[PDB]
Design a protein around this motif. Structure first.
Motif, PDB file in Angstrom:
ATOM      1  N   UNK A  78       0.833  -1.199   0.000  1.00 27.73           N
ATOM      2  CA  UNK A  78       0.000   0.000   0.000  1.00 27.73           C
ATOM      3  C   UNK A  78       0.867   1.249   0.000  1.00 27.73           C
ATOM      4  N   UNK A  79       1.880   1.278   0.871  1.00 31.23           N
ATOM      5  CA  UNK A  79       2.696   2.479   1.023  1.00 31.23           C
ATOM      6  C   UNK A  79       3.200   3.009  -0.313  1.00 31.23           C
ATOM      7  N   UNK A  80       3.248   2.164  -1.339  1.00 30.80           N
ATOM      8  CA  UNK A  80       3.640   2.564  -2.683  1.00 30.80           C
ATOM      9  C   UNK A  80       2.469   2.659  -3.649  1.00 30.80           C
ATOM     10  N   UNK A  81       1.488   1.759  -3.551  1.00 35.14           N
ATOM     11  CA  UNK A  81       0.426   1.720  -4.552  1.00 35.14           C
ATOM     12  C   UNK A  81      -0.604   2.829  -4.361  1.00 35.14           C
ATOM     13  N   UNK A  82      -0.801   3.295  -3.123  1.00 35.17           N
ATOM     14  CA  UNK A  82      -1.837   4.293  -2.878  1.00 35.17           C
ATOM     15  C   UNK A  82      -1.537   5.593  -3.612  1.00 35.17           C
ATOM     16  N   UNK A  83      -0.267   6.006  -3.629  1.00 34.85           N
ATOM     17  CA  UNK A  83       0.110   7.225  -4.336  1.00 34.85           C
ATOM     18  C   UNK A  83      -0.340   7.168  -5.788  1.00 34.85           C
ATOM     19  N   UNK A  84       0.014   6.085  -6.478  1.00 34.51           N
ATOM     20  CA  UNK A  84      -0.276   5.984  -7.901  1.00 34.51           C
ATOM     21  C   UNK A  84      -1.773   5.874  -8.155  1.00 34.51           C
ATOM     22  N   UNK A  85      -2.489   5.111  -7.328  1.00 36.26           N
ATOM     23  CA  UNK A  85      -3.929   4.990  -7.553  1.00 36.26           C
ATOM     24  C   UNK A  85      -4.605   6.341  -7.365  1.00 36.26           C
ATOM     25  N   UNK A  86      -4.192   7.100  -6.344  1.00 37.58           N
ATOM     26  CA  UNK A  86      -4.761   8.430  -6.162  1.00 37.58           C
ATOM     27  C   UNK A  86      -4.432   9.331  -7.342  1.00 37.58           C
ATOM     28  N   UNK A  87      -3.203   9.252  -7.857  1.00 40.69           N
ATOM     29  CA  UNK A  87      -2.848  10.085  -9.003  1.00 40.69           C
ATOM     30  C   UNK A  87      -3.740   9.770 -10.197  1.00 40.69           C
ATOM     31  N   UNK A  88      -3.984   8.483 -10.449  1.00 39.86           N
ATOM     32  CA  UNK A  88      -4.866   8.106 -11.549  1.00 39.86           C
ATOM     33  C   UNK A  88      -6.276   8.641 -11.330  1.00 39.86           C
ATOM     34  N   UNK A  89      -6.789   8.533 -10.100  1.00 47.46           N
ATOM     35  CA  UNK A  89      -8.124   9.053  -9.820  1.00 47.46           C
ATOM     36  C   UNK A  89      -8.188  10.555 -10.065  1.00 47.46           C
ATOM     37  N   UNK A  90      -7.170  11.281  -9.611  1.00 50.54           N
ATOM     38  CA  UNK A  90      -7.131  12.727  -9.792  1.00 50.54           C
ATOM     39  C   UNK A  90      -7.141  13.089 -11.273  1.00 50.54           C
ATOM     40  N   UNK A  91      -6.293  12.427 -12.064  1.00 56.72           N
ATOM     41  CA  UNK A  91      -6.221  12.738 -13.488  1.00 56.72           C
ATOM     42  C   UNK A  91      -7.537  12.430 -14.193  1.00 56.72           C
ATOM     43  N   UNK A  92      -8.145  11.279 -13.892  1.00 53.13           N
ATOM     44  CA  UNK A  92      -9.387  10.932 -14.571  1.00 53.13           C
ATOM     45  C   UNK A  92     -10.517  11.879 -14.189  1.00 53.13           C
ATOM     46  N   UNK A  93     -10.562  12.339 -12.934  1.00 58.44           N
ATOM     47  CA  UNK A  93     -11.562  13.342 -12.578  1.00 58.44           C
ATOM     48  C   UNK A  93     -11.320  14.652 -13.314  1.00 58.44           C
ATOM     49  N   UNK A  94     -10.058  15.061 -13.458  1.00 62.21           N
ATOM     50  CA  UNK A  94      -9.773  16.279 -14.217  1.00 62.21           C
ATOM     51  C   UNK A  94     -10.317  16.151 -15.632  1.00 62.21           C
ATOM     52  N   UNK A  95     -10.050  15.015 -16.275  1.00 63.35           N
ATOM     53  CA  UNK A  95     -10.481  14.854 -17.661  1.00 63.35           C
ATOM     54  C   UNK A  95     -12.002  14.780 -17.764  1.00 63.35           C
ATOM     55  N   UNK A  96     -12.658  14.153 -16.784  1.00 62.23           N
ATOM     56  CA  UNK A  96     -14.117  14.134 -16.771  1.00 62.23           C
ATOM     57  C   UNK A  96     -14.676  15.547 -16.664  1.00 62.23           C
ATOM     58  N   UNK A  97     -14.102  16.355 -15.770  1.00 56.88           N
ATOM     59  CA  UNK A  97     -14.548  17.738 -15.627  1.00 56.88           C
ATOM     60  C   UNK A  97     -14.366  18.484 -16.941  1.00 56.88           C
ATOM     61  N   UNK A  98     -13.235  18.266 -17.616  1.00 58.18           N
ATOM     62  CA  UNK A  98     -13.050  18.864 -18.936  1.00 58.18           C
ATOM     63  C   UNK A  98     -14.173  18.476 -19.884  1.00 58.18           C
ATOM     64  N   UNK A  99     -14.417  17.174 -20.030  1.00 54.06           N
ATOM     65  CA  UNK A  99     -15.392  16.727 -21.016  1.00 54.06           C
ATOM     66  C   UNK A  99     -16.797  17.190 -20.677  1.00 54.06           C
ATOM     67  N   UNK A 100     -17.060  17.528 -19.413  1.00 55.46           N
ATOM     68  CA  UNK A 100     -18.372  18.060 -19.063  1.00 55.46           C
ATOM     69  C   UNK A 100     -18.652  19.368 -19.800  1.00 55.46           C
ATOM     70  N   UNK A 101     -17.659  20.250 -19.884  1.00 57.84           N
ATOM     71  CA  UNK A 101     -17.862  21.563 -20.477  1.00 57.84           C
ATOM     72  C   UNK A 101     -18.111  21.453 -21.980  1.00 57.84           C
ATOM     73  N   UNK A 102     -18.740  22.464 -22.575  1.00 52.47           N
ATOM     74  CA  UNK A 102     -18.927  22.468 -24.032  1.00 52.47           C
ATOM     75  C   UNK A 102     -17.624  22.760 -24.759  1.00 52.47           C
TER      76      UNK A 102
END
Lengths: 50, 37, 50
Positions: free
Chosen positions: C24-48
């Protein structure tokens, strides 16, 4: 309710277990050293100049 | 912490539940088979 | 019954202790980074488009 409360307890235990302790074992020494030095200097400044 | 909760709920909680259910069902059968009505 | 239940609790504690935390001490960082990036891209695609 009970199961999830236990899960929160377990999760908190794990987080304190790895992330906190690995960093603490090194950071506590330095923080204590800083506290010791600042108390020494405070004690100095308490006394008069002469 | 959210990742921790998710992984704790999914990965090993069901594993522990399976083993715990195994022992529970074995003891239920063993305990109640002895009783006489 | 009671002793074996305690043994299961202890075994679960050990398994969460070593195998889970070391990874975990290593995997949590990367999983959170992936979640953050995918939420950013979702927010982008929401806009026109404009």
């Amino acid at each position: 309710y009970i199961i999830l409360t236990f899960v929160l307890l377990l999760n908190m235990l794990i987080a304190l277990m790895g992330e906190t302790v690995g960093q603490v074992s090194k950071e506590s020494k330095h923080i204590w050293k800083l506290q010791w030095a600042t108390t020494i200097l405070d004690i100095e400044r308490s006394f008069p100049v002469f | 912490y959210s990742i921790m909760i998710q992984k704790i709920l999914f990965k090993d909680l069901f594993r522990f539940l399976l083993v715990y259910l195994l022992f529970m069902i074995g003891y239920a059968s063993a305990l109640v088979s002895l009783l006489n009505p």
